[PDB]
Amino acid sequence: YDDAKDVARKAWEMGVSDPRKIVFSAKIGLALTIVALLIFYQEPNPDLSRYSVWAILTVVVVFEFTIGATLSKGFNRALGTLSAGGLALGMAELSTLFWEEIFCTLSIFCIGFLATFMKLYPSMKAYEYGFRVFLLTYCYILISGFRTGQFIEVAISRFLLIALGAGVSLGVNMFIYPIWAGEDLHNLVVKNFMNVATSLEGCVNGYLRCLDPVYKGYRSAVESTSQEESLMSFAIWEPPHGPYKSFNYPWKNYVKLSGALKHCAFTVMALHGCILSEIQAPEERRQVFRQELQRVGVEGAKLLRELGEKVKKMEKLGPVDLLFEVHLAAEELQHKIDKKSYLLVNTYESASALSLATFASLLIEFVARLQNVVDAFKELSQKA
């Protein structure tokens, strides 16, 4: 019973935090019950209601979270289905022309074999639903057409059914509280700034706290380029929905600003590795560089926090001279290790000392990786 409390809590916790799941499930439920209500109350005549399941099963099979996703995946499945339709109907008139059972058997071996590879090819890894709905539509059309004499009228009826289902699908998805895929990416390029500034602050302050929240911080930023590169495929399909003024919005720098950041979060990786490493500097020697090591972590996060606030607001005003206090912090960090360098050099009696030299110069590097981002965001600030 206590475990079941969490399951209810899990739904509530993901619910109250993000009111985008409840609304999506409400939208799909509404679409399904509207199709069913239309079937039962407005089309009760059995003259032709069998195919009425096309109508409710197409709403279920083509309704997805983001307008871009629904629209592009509908386009790909429509190309697969219509290509199978044209090619299969050509093969169907042929396959009635005189040994047609054997010809129509080979005509499905060939399609299965050819479509399988282009499904399995490494490049076409996300265009897999298209190959499934093409291999699975060739087969259906071909069997039904070998069975029936004049298929094309029933094919016309099936298309208006899968246009009466998908019509309501797209309409309800786009008009009733839409969920775009453009601002699912503008709210993601600005999320990584927030969970990297803490990863920087976690790794600078976890190194010294003596006498994981960090591991979930920076691994989200790094593991998003495989995602933002998808949300860049979905983002091109939406209209200029609101602030995103014109068509051809540069959803190419949001994977470039998140590119220079994910490249700047490859020191915070090794910056964390120094605290997880089996060799690390002793407590008493870390706490001689306490100020400057904290000084970079303190100010270094403040900039990278408000670099996000320059994306969330997408402030068409400017990032003017951001890195002065991090440069000063890094410069006098190095000049601070110029005096107390004997704590870094003369087996293991010197392998542990010297890992304190490895953090100090994995943190100055992060200061240098931080000039690349501001330029990779200065292009995005102006032209976008």
Added chain:
Amino acid sequence: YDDAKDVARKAWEMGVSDPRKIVFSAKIGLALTIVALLIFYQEPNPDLSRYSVWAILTVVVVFEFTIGATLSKGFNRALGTLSAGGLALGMAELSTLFWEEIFCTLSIFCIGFLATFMKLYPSMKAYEYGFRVFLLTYCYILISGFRTGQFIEVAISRFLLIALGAGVSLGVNMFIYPIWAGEDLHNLVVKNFMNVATSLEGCVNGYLRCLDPVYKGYRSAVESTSQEESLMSFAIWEPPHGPYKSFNYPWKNYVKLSGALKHCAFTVMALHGCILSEIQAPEERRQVFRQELQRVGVEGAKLLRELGEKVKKMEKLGPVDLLFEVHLAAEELQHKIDKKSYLLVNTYESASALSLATFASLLIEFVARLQNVVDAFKELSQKA
């Protein structure tokens, strides 16, 4: 025409290199044409051939690359379909009992809404096909059952059709040249050793070559734990297929040995970052530590190469005292920087000079991360 040559080459190159795609497409083609041949030549009577498309569309919808995947995903879809069947038939006898159009409309809004969340919950992210085939089977059964009087005989017929399709599906997938998901993971835990030993050798030898192949090396090992954790879900479903002697084979250390390796390939990340960093040691100063820096990279790869050859062979003989020459190499590397330490310490005139403190003590660390793996593989060598 020249670009089209590559497309043919791409299929051939992925074909001749891996003869696992051609055989899979041949298997799916054979299944589809056998179902079609069975329909046309052995069941030509139209007394009942409409549902004969269940038979060919179920082979297409449930045939997958690995026996484990086909079998587990068939089990999940069967649970979804049979659960929708039992619950929907209960709702169907009720939904004929006396305002049943409105009750049967609400009975599909409720199912859509409830199933949407458990599809969208973060945990149930791979169990998404199950929720789609449950939401999409409740709907079909319920519409058809509201339409027809005594559905259960037609439901029995549909189940023997989707047992005459899936029967041939599983049979052809398992008997005609099977493709397991256990040895798709034993051949993957041993692949990461081969593309990390080169990443180590690339980053040690790319640092010095003056007077990307590495970036594809270690990023494959790190980006596989999200994959090997799936191949651990598929691996439990196969029988003891061959060498994997008994049931309950420990496919839990292959994600633990590949866990200690992916944890050892987090220095080779930062080891590479030092050559991509905007601050790096000068040429003339790198080539004073040329021998020992190469010495660790040379011998350090030789061990990690033959750690794989202790997995590919899965040699039930032993990894006896592997790390002696890497320990000596790391020990006298540190003792080599004990003499020539003035090249590491006394703004930027010393930020570049101390980048050698950070390669040499990002490479001694990799030697220490390498004791964890041999222990995390000594457990796997004995009990597996």
